Amino acid sequence: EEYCASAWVGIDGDTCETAILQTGVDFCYEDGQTSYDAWYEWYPDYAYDFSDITISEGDSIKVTVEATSKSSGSATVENLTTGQSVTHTFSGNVEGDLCETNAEWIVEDFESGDSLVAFADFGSVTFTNAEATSGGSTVGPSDATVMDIEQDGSVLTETSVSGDSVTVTYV
């Protein structure tokens, strides 16, 4: 079966339900087939694959979303290893306005069809250089609400933060 997890950064989606400006990478494993697929999403619009970026195991990926307004922004995935970068600019006609009240670094068990995708053992994802900009402030995840995935009684992740990182470890 397919197991995936996505690691993404995003604005909103937590206490702001109207939009999420997010981009990140799906890691999937299916019967030996590993795939990494960068995507962006301005939730509630569909995620779109960044088909123009190749992500491989071991690559350092920088993911950035930038809201240029509550209804515009960009998602950028940079493959620092490969030197390939993709950006997608959201130029309005977005499906929801940001509140810009959540900034997040998330490893997600995303929906795939009628259920969450089976959650891949991604080992650990550490978002380093985990910085959110709030006005003129550069804020790290240290004061962030730490979230972990719990499903059907099982905690699937252990998350820790530091001043500039978020580590999500598959449990």
Binding site: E57, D121, A130, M147, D148, E150, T159
Partner: protein, 37 residues
């Protein structure tokens, strides 16, 4: 906080206009957690 789908760190505040993070793409394998029924 626990959720069904999100792990990680959520800043709750205001005027977040940029979020960035860098990660090394890990090897993924099949998950062994999760329910069976």
């Amino acid at each position: 906080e626990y959720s069904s789908n999100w792990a990680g760190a959520v800043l709750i505040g205001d005027g977040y206009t940029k979020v960035t993070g860098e990660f090394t793409v890990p090897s993924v394998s099949a998950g062994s957690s999760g329910s069976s029924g």
